[model samples]
Target: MAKAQPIEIAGHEFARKADALAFMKVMLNRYRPGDIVSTVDGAFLVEALKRHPDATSKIGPGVRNFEVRSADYGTQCFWILRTDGSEERFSYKKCVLEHHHHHH
Candidate 1:
């Protein structure tokens, strides 16, 4: 049998949603009610939950309404909520030379 292609999220690759979940779980620690995963990865999860809410133990094993948002600059950055009543931001462009450079 031919090997299946891996799914990529923010440059990370995984075989399936379960595999991705395991990888992400370590990164995010745990999935709370208001917490968010990477947009690309989260979409896969949203579909799973939509079809069967009992898919994973990460969040409530039931129906849920997760919040999502993005900027006009495309996938450069995003914001996500946490269980600890805080938000986490991830920005790809901020690593660039001119972007991260010091200003006068």
Candidate 2:
């Protein structure tokens, strides 16, 4: 669940969530607002970010940098400092369907 395998981002492979986070941090600082990081599956990247324990702390409020945009079917766009930017926008697809029902 914690990204057991490596994740590919911006043509770079990261074996651990921490490594990816670190890479993103650097990228966010390096690139200007509206700069594209990579075109990847939003669902996949979302899963990776959600599974990371440090995501909340690392990407906390006031420093939010990463941005995911819904692109054509089965395709997603990623950017850095996107806050500082949509056409025929569609809801981002989810990699997994999570059940939130509570069972007694």
Candidate 3:
């Protein structure tokens, strides 16, 4: 797995994936009536909850609305929430291979 990208907000480091998940929980817990609380991973979590409000967790299970597929550039990944052409999520599969052709 790739190394996690830590987000530093309000003089603290939101480091582990679990930390982000925990942050989402705390934010949701503080939501009031008619308030829209967008979490760190809201794009995905929102849909995950929409289908399963009783779900105890989101990322742990694979019952997701998004997908990871290969593009001409690389593998692309995005969510239905932000699927309105405002932005695009694409990725490339990287690998290190040993070649016998040449060496310095």
Candidate 4:
């Protein structure tokens, strides 16, 4: 099998989307109460969706950041930020729905 491509964000390189997200969470927490990822390069959407197939169902790729958000019911989602100041919610539903923390 082919190795996962490295994703570079803010001068940091990660071999997986999960790793990048983990790193971003720490970096973002340094300033804000929430996490706002900066970018997702190299077929970001494709690899991300594939990596967490269970979390996402309808959305596809091409994005810079995926904002992490919470719901009243306690479900979490990875939201996409658009250039026009809009947010697209996809690639997640609940904690038990997907797995992105470890390699397959």
Candidate 5:
């Protein structure tokens, strides 16, 4: 098995993905839309935000600081800026349903 990826946000370090996700869930609940969460890994942060039930987020294009080895794309680490509800949720829902029906 692959080693667990460590995620750090708001000065808190999580050694496991599940712990990071749980911490992010609490942060999402506490923060209002338009708030920003600084993280060491933007890709991981983006994934964390997507996992939240009611939170929507976008990567801040202006906040790139440093590059990490595991970036999903070639983009550097950046902030996760929350956004108002919109089509993001719709697409996510559709994707989930599509996967459920895609047994072949």
Candidate 6:
């Protein structure tokens, strides 16, 4: 199997793109395997997935920089920023359904 990628955002590291784009892949009519993504778009998709957890459902409103707003596309949370500062723009995405923050 291939290795899962790693990424960082807002000074915090994340294993995946926060679960939003998992749903986006279903409706990616024009996406390809090597599309380039901007930091803002990555962040946007990540937030989109989170708001709409259902993989087969439409994306809901999302938050960015702690403020809620709507955007051009219906998408989920994304971490397009990979460990090598690159993106994996395949027609599908994979993410953990939950997070485990080690706070005590």
Once fitted onto the true fold, the runs of candidate 3 whose alpha carbons sit more than 4 angstroms away are: 1-13, 38-104
* Each model's total of backbone clashes: 0, 0, 1, 1, 0, 13
Best by TM-score: 4
Question: Highest lDDT among the candidates is held by which one?
Answer: 4
42: Cα error in model 3, Å: 8.1
Q: lDDT (0-100) at residue 26 of candidate 4?
A: 59
Q: List, residue by residue over 1-85, the lDDT tens digit for candidate 5.
A: 6965455544556775456545544544454444344454444454544444544233323323212221234322223323332
Q: Local error of candidate 1 at 40, Å?
A: 15
Question: What is the TM-score (0 to 1) of candidate 6?
Answer: 0.24
Off by over 4 Å in 4: 1-33, 38-46, 49-62, 93-104
| Pairwise lDDT winner, candidates 1 and 3 | 1
Query: Candidates' TM-scores?
Result: 0.27, 0.29, 0.26, 0.36, 0.29, 0.24
Tens-digit lDDT track of model 6 for 13-104 = 45556433433444343343334444454554554444434522323232222112122355422223334334222223434333555246
Comparison by TM-score, 3 against 6, better one: 3
As a TM-score, model 2 comes out at 0.29
- Per-residue C-alpha lDDT of model 1 across residues 1-104, encoded as one tens digit per residue: 59766755545576665565565445343443335555665554444333333334333333233343444432222243445455444332222123434467
Please list all clashing residue pairs in model 1, or write none if there are none: none
- Evaluation by TM-score, superior candidate among 4 and 6: 4
Tell how far residue 3 is off in model 4, in angstroms. Answer: 18
